[model samples]
Target: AETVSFNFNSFSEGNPAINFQGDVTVLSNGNIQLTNLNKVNSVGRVLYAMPVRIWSSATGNVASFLTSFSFEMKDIKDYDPADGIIFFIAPEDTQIPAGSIGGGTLGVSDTKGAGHFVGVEFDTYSNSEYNDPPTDHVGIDVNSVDSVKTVPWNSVSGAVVKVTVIYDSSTKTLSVAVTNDNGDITTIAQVVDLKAKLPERVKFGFSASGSLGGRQIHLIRSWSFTSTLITT
Candidate 1:
C-alpha cells in the first residue's frame, strides 16, 4: 500500500470499524469511555477492527506514521490514582489477556507475550518492579510494562490532554509529544526498528486500567492517524 489515513473526531454509536472489549463503552456524548469512573480492576480497549499494513515485505520499508488524540483523565477517588492509559500496537489477533488485567499491567503486560508489542503509557501509578521514576508520567514500553524511556507528566497542564505520536521511518525514530490544556508540552523519543519489533501488519488502539480502591475516569474524546509507506 502507498498510504493509508483515518480520523475519528469522536466515536458515534456502532461504528463498524471500531471494536470495544472488556468494560469499554461509548458514551452518549460520543467519547469512548474506557471504564466507569468508580470501578476497580477495570480493563477495557477500543481497537481498530482490522489489521493494518504498517510495513511492506515486497519493498522492505516501514511506514512513517503519526497519530493524534485528545483524552481527559480525572483522578476522582484519591490524591493517589492507580494505573492509567496506554496506546499500543500488537499482533492483529491479540486481546486483553486473561490474567493480570488491571492495575500495573495496564491490559497488555504479559510474560508470555513479551517482545510482541509496543506501548506508550500515560501512567498515574508508579511501581518499583518497573523501575518507575515517579507517578503521573509518560513512558514507552516494548512488549513489557517496564518502560524503556519515560518523562514526567506536566501536572501544570489540565486534566484534558493532547498527545501526538510520530514515527519517522528514515531515522527509525518514534517520538511522542504530550501537551496539556495549558500548552505545557513534554516530549520523548527513541530509536526503534519497526520491521524487527513488529509484524508487517498489526493492530493499534487504546487500553486502560484502574485500581481496586481508586477511581480514574478516562475518556478519549478524539483521535486521528495518517501514514505513508515508501514502496519504491
Candidate 2:
C-alpha cells in the first residue's frame, strides 16, 4: 500500500531529489552531516527530500505514513555540545527564517507565525527559555518549538541511533521509537489530529543547530519514508 518511498545511503553529484542549505554536507562515507566544529555560533542546517501530498483538504483525512533514519552526534573537540536535531514534516514552502538563533531553536524557525510544521526533536542541550531538560531528551513539537511531550534520551555522542516515527490516520495517533547501538529501544505514542495540524501536502526533512562555545557534528547514515497517500 505504499505509494511513495525513498532510501538514501549516500548522495552523489546530481541527486536532484535532495535539497540542502546552510552548513549541511554529504560525507565521503555517504552520510549527511548537518554541521561541523569549524562553524561556531548560531548555525542552522536543513535537509529535505521529495515533496508529497499527505491528504486532500476537501476530504479532511490524512494518510498513514512512516519515516526512519539512523544518525550520530559527535563533539569534534570534546567540547560540550548544545542543541540537537529534528525530523520534521512541513509545508513545501517552509524556509529557515532569516537571522534565526541556534540552541533552543534547533535550527528551525521558532517565530510564532514564521511557519507551520511538526518536528520531533532529539535535544541535547537545555534552554531555560524553552524549559528544556538538563539531560538529553526527545520531544514532539507542533507549530511552536516548545515540545508538547518529552522522554529522556540515553544514547551517547558518536553512537549511532535508529529512529522510527509513524502516523496512523485511522486512529489519529503518532508514535516514535528510538533504538540505541546497544539494541535498547524506547518508545512514546500520542494521539495527534494531523488533519487539523498540517497542510494537505508537505516536505519531510531534518534540521539541526548549535550556538557559541557548544557544537557537534550531526550525521545521518540513511533515511527512508513510506506512505499510502496519493498526491493530488
Candidate 3:
C-alpha cells in the first residue's frame, strides 16, 4: 500500500507539483482557494495536484483506493451560488475545456468531448440542459456532465464539509461519504469498473466555476489518498 497526504497549510508548503489555472490562489489562512467569490461568468478553474500512475506495476491497475478531503464554499453575496465543484480523475493532460461556461458543465466537462474524465460532483445550481436535481446534490459522472447516480446534498453557505471516497476493486464498488459541520454523515455508493472507464494512469484534482447570478469561494483545507495494489 502507498499513501499520500496533504494538509494544504500553504500552497508552497503542500505539493509543489500542482497544476492550477484560472483564478486559483493560496490564501493567508493556508487554504487553497479555487475561485474568487466576486468573479462572474467564469469559464473553468481547476487544480490538478497529483498524478497516480496505477499501471506502472503488474498489480497496480486494479488496486483499491481511498481519498478524502475537506472543503468549504462561501457565498459572500448571499445570492444563490452558480455552478459548483467536482473532484475528478482523468487521463494524463486532462484539463478544462475552452468554451465551458460553468452551469451544468461544472467547469470540467464539455459537449465537444474535451474532458475525458470521471468525477464526483457537488452541484449547487440546477440547469435544465443537464437535468440536474432541483436541490443541491452530489452525483457521480463518467466522461459526461450528466450524472449516473445522484443524491440530495444539504450545503450551507460558509460551512466546512468533509468528503471521503473509496473504490473497492474486488466488488467494483465506489462509495462516497459526506460529513457536515454538525457531524452528520451521508453515504452513497455505486458499482463501477475503473479499468474499463479510464486509462491506466490518471490525474486527480478539483474544479469549479461561477455565474452571473452568484459566485463562490472554493477552498480546500486538507486532502489524502491511499492505494493498495491488488495481488492474488
What candidate 1 gets wrong by more than 4 Å, as runs, is: 78-80, 111-115, 155-158
lDDT of each: 0.80, 0.76, 0.74
How do the residues 154-220 of candidate 3 rate in per-residue lDDT, one tens digit apiece?
8787898989999887787889999987888888788977888888778878888777775777777
- Candidates 1 and 3 compared: the better one by lDDT is 1
Q: Rank by lDDT, highest first.
A: 1, 2, 3
Clashing pairs in 1: none
Model 2, CA-based lDDT: 0.76
Q: Candidate 1's error at 105, in angstroms?
A: 0.9
Which candidate number maximizes lDDT? 1
Higher-TM-score candidate of 1 and 3: 1
Of 1 and 2, the candidate ranking higher by lDDT: 1
Least well predicted 10-residue stretch by lDDT in candidate 1:
107-116
lDDT (Cα, 0-100) at 122 in candidate 1: 88
